[PDB]
Amino acid sequence: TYMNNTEAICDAKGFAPFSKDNGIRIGSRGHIFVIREPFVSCSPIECRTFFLTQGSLLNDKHSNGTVKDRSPFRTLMSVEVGQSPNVYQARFEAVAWSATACHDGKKWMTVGVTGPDSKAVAVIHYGGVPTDVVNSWAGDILRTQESSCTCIQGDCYWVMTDGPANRQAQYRIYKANQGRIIGQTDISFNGGHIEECSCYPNDGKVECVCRDNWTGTNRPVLVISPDLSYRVGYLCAGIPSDTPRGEDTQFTGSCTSPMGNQGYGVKGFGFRQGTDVWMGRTISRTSRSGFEILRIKNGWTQTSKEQIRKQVVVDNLNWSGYSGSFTLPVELSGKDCLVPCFWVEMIRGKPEEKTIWTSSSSIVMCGVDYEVADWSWHDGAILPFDI
Amino acid sequence: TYMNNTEAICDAKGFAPFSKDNGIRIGSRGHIFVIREPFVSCSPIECRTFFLTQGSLLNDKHSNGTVKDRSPFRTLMSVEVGQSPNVYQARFEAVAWSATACHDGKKWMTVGVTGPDSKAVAVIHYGGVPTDVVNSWAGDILRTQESSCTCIQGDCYWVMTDGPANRQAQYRIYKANQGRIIGQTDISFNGGHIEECSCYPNDGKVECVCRDNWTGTNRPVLVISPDLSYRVGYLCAGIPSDTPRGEDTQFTGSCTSPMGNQGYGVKGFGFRQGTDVWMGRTISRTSRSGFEILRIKNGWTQTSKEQIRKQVVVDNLNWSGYSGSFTLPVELSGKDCLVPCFWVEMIRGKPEEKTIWTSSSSIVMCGVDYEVADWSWHDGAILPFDI
Amino acid sequence: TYMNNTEAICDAKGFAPFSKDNGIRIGSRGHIFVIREPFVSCSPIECRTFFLTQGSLLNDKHSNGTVKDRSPFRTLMSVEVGQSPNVYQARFEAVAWSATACHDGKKWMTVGVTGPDSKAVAVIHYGGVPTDVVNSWAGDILRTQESSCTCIQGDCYWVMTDGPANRQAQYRIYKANQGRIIGQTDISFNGGHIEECSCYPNDGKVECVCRDNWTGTNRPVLVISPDLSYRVGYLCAGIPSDTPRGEDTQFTGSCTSPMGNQGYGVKGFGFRQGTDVWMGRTISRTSRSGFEILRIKNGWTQTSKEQIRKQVVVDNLNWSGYSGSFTLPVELSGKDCLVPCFWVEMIRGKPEEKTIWTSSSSIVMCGVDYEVADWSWHDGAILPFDI
Amino acid sequence: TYMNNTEAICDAKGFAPFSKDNGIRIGSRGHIFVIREPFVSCSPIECRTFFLTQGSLLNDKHSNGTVKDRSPFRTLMSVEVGQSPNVYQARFEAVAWSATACHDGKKWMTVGVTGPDSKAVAVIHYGGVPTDVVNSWAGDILRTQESSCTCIQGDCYWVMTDGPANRQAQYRIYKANQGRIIGQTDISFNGGHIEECSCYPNDGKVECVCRDNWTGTNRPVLVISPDLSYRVGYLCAGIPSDTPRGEDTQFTGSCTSPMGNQGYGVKGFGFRQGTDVWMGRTISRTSRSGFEILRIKNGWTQTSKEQIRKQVVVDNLNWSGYSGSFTLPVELSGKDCLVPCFWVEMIRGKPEEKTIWTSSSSIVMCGVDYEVADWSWHDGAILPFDI
Numbered sequence A, B, C, D: 001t002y003m004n005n006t007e008a009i010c011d012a013k014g015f016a017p018f019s020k021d022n023g024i025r026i027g028s029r030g031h032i033f034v035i036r037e038p039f040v041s042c043s044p045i046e047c048r049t050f051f052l053t054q055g056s057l058l059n060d061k062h063s064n065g066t067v068k069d070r071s072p073f074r075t076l077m078s079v080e081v082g083q084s085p086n087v088y089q090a091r092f093e094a095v096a097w098s099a100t101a102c103h104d105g106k107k108w109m110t111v112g113v114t115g116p117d118s119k120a121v122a123v124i125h126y127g128g129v130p131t132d133v134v135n136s137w138a139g140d141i142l143r144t145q146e147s148s149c150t151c152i153q154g155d156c157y158w159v160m161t162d163g164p165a166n167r168q169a170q171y172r173i174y175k176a177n178q179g180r181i182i183g184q185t186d187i188s189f190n191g192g193h194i195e196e197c198s199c200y201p202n203d204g205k206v207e208c209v210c211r212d213n214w215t216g217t218n219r220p221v222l223v224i225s226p227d228l229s230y231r232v233g234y235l236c237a238g239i240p241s242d243t244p245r246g247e248d249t250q251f252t253g254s255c256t257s258p259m260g261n262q263g264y265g266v267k268g269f270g271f272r273q274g275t276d277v278w279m280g281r282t283i284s285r286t287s288r289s290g291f292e293i294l295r296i297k298n299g300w301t302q303t304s305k306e307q308i309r310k311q312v313v314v315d316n317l318n319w320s321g322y323s324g325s326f327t328l329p330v331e332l333s334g335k336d337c338l339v340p341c342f343w344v345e346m347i348r349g350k351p352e353e354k355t356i357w358t359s360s361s362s363i364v365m366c367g368v369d370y371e372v373a374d375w376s377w378h379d380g381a382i383l384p385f386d387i
Ligand SMILES: CC(=O)N[C@H]1[C@H]([C@@H](O)[C@H](O)CO)OC(C(=O)O)=C(C/C=C/c2ccccc2)[C@@H]1O
Pocket: A036, A037, A054, A065, A068, A069, A070, A097, A098, A141, A143, A164, A165, A166, A195, A196, A213, A265, A266, A358
């Protein structure tokens, strides 16, 4: 039975802790994969943490990070949300140095890009087998969300980028049913730049807040209709939500074009709330440390900088990193609306710490009807490790 | 299908061993969480050990206990009753430095309190997702049972405390259906003090024997009707059942008020038997060592000190600690009545042993139709460990 | 749906390897329980290895065997047949320093005896919970099969011994339905001695070949009708099948009384074949080394020493030990008859090897329509271990 | 419900990565079996990696390879495709130093040959139990595919060899239903030589490309009709596909007889494509290093050397080894045709590397509608290990 994700996103005063896996502390002695980009997606029955494995284990010579991001040993695997990315509970998903995964109601669909940078291959899995394939259309590191993809009425949608990391690239929407690609569209977005989209179903369409790694501190935003018509631009709110970024007071927002004169970036998320936005961001405007979620009044549709609520979840004394979006299925939450939820990756080791290795642990938050007090559910590992 | 827990508690001559997990001995070489407060609750199909993890593993630097009780790395997880709290069979439940869990017949409901002491948050999970939330109402370490909660006809009930550990605090009953709080009541109990309740269903109402950490050596007792009307007071029997406590002969019992002039305490349990009580208690009146269960004639309703049966389960040469209550569902035991069962936590390491770490193993006993001989199913680990 | 075990035992020319767990070799680096007495019983859907754990792990200080056989840390757990007794795939069964387990078609029933030698308690589990209890009736180490028990038409039967290890003791049959004891009978057997019975269903009754630890080199044999009437005596064949034992040529068989003037013994098995017997035995008549299965013509009902077939399975250069019986359910094998199967425990470490510890691995053989060549599927661990 | 494998093999432009287990890198610290011959077979619901375990673990004294290939500690076990052959997720299949496994739609059938070389025994398992047996018919190391077997309409077929490794031997087809052998035929093939067949269902018959270890660089090929009539010979294409082998230009192909004057060999695969062939082969013509798949036009039925497509999957700088065939069931892929898929074993350690041990990791590729770029998904372990 196909999941209907046609409802509106729940309006939410605050965010409550869902889980915390404790990957790295546990991996001081347990058998834990060295991972990065640990996103969450939910099936009608259970939510799971997916993650790229570097194919090695914490506290072992193979975690020696000289090993490439985009290596043949990089696999997409998963476990249940809140469990560490450990070998003995891991489920194999796909070979991928960049990934997206989402469940439609019957089965899991996953998309793992691997292979050489000039002609990468993306295998689409459905229910545990390859079902279809996308090739590099631009010969420059084919990539995708690193976050849950979005299934509405049996059809699953996702965004992909082919091209340079720091100048104009090419961006596409892709549409599958039961693991077969059944539609796709280029995204006309000049000067603009889109990477690592964080999407969620909302009102029968698909909203993503993604990353601009070229010019913009604000995040690109698109809304994909079921016929892969779309609208694209930037999260309107007059507050930079990327990293690095300039201070809030030196930033004029825009619904149209990038703002800020910085390159680089980091993956983030945002949730539409009527016309408001819940937008996540690192606390540091410089590095990937600390994490907070601001609610800007009218920020989805205005250059507003009127802030209703702010809730710290990782304090500025602790490393954070990637963040992404997903919803709770109605069939799990009880609600008549789609509960917004996010995860926050917390990076330990290189480049900011003196270890041979790099990995991350995560924490997942879900949208509730109440204000939740500020806190810091930071990673917690005692660095360095035995090496 | 909802579990009916409306039956009476089985009248039981004695207690038979259900399980013994051997957590700490096993964790000398295996991959075992460092845990505390390892209670048991049963679903129509299986009983499980829940436990707070300190997020680290035995024989590892992160077990270094300087780490706070109420830390962001403290998670509620579980395994099947009798299995050790090991990583590779663990199921994630919630982020919580204080927890309660119970199954209603369809799904598991869990409640994990985490966050800062001045405004703690309790996320209610249902079937593996956050469904509702309680906030600190008194700004002083929001807490709960550390024992199975109680589901009668689909609705699950539990007790919570907001306030000081050593003077008057505030106590509430809470009532959920399918993860949504649908009712709650304050508990008018002045001079009295309630913490870490050990509840069980009995006669269509909910009976808890809880801990008074302020004035009383005897245990508070409440009986919650389905409309959250209640009665509250103390276990009548003229025998102190807390720790520390005075000797039996210097103690006049009371159904109304605390007795003994000691502060402190430890979590314990008791089971109504018509008018008698099966009351558990440490053997030492000073420290948490050894464990025994006395049956006092008319002790539920009298100041009686008439003891019918006594059964040692952990001898005074061995560490014990927390204890709690739960029943076997009819759908599991075969019986027309609710089998009383308890667990006993057995604490090793700090503060009484010279290790860096502290954890505990457990043993579960269930009510039977026969006298069972005294014995000691103590923890057994050979301290200290490699460190 | 209840298993009918009313069929006849399959007539079988030979025995084929079912499994080999490799427990001890694997436990040189893996996380493997230190075990003894690893028997097998089958459910309509899967066969499992049960085993007493000493509660510790190979290559760890807690395996230090000074630890008692009959300790409070001794638990009955299980895994699927052929898998090692490892922590992360183990299922908890009961607290027991002596055990029997068997499946009736709906659920697993297990029986774990634990507690003090003067008044031991046997908890009967059904579907994962205590359901009933037997107490010491003779105050001298209550014990049982260490082998699969036998379920015919929903009712499960097993044999127990209360008394001395080396002179007359007391022996009982016990009969459960759904975990409730519903019948029992004393076994009038003077001068005779019964321990550690190896039973199997055959022709709607229950046949056990058990061990006499007092006087007899030949094995006691009983046949339990559904009304717990019985016949008891000795396996007729004129060949000693216990260990230690005298040579075949100095042994006159008997259907009635023990023969041989030795005390001691070891657990073994035998399978009726019309009037023949398949009888297992160590190769060494002195120690527990090597294993073979002889088919004696008319040996169930005669003092015969006419040997049709012999098949070595563990050679005299390798340690063996315990052996037991069980059948394959029709619902698994396809056959219209009950396939005889046995397991052979293979003991490493103390007393015969210079280690601190003692454990064993196993191998399971099933009855087939062909002669199978002699071989040795011995344990294989390289002793001693890191200690 | 029985799987229909009666469809034609999908015509496929290229091969996409299915999985990569990372066994050996992971086994630098994790608990990983030392394995060889890690093939894949699929059930209607999931594909699994089967493998011979040497019964020991990486980084342990028991991996010390002096241990025989054909030892009593050699077991067939399995895990889900893409997961490493680790102890805690392993499922026991059979005792076997040579194996084949395949699922018919209802259950798994496995065939494990073990025992002495002069009279080896092959136990057939069905749904987890021994159901039937084949004995050595030629007294010279009874062996089989090391690759998925083939189930068409409930009946499963497989090829076996009894005889010398380097001169004429004997070869048989075998046909089971529900674990009972129900048919078999000798394969009249003089001068020819057949070992380690790699089969797949195609057009309602069974096609195997196998290994000739006597005279031929080209691979034997057979096509087994459901009545075990057959045709046998050699893959026609004028290109040697074994290892070692001569260069392509010095090789005249044949549909009839072996070509090349070399002994030895290694297991490989091939897939019929109408009249073309997808044939796999090591890159090195000398050693087992690198892996590629050529599509020869008309190569199934001609001496053609017209090459349409070539796709490297493991580069000549990296060890490869065994390869085998299997299909995706329609009930998994969605397709109206049978998706060709193969796996490639990647051997580390002895004989080519300076370690005490030998094992291998694998990677699985499935047939798709597109050209996939060359790459190398090599094993990746950093040799030697701690030993
Ligand atoms: C496809 C890819 O490699 N994406 C990068 C991505 C970056 O290249 C741009 O978004 C594309 O222009 O950015 C980052 C990043 O910003 O940190 C990552 C995440 C790093 C994973 C990692 C870290 C340490 C060792 C191995 C892998 C990703 O691996």
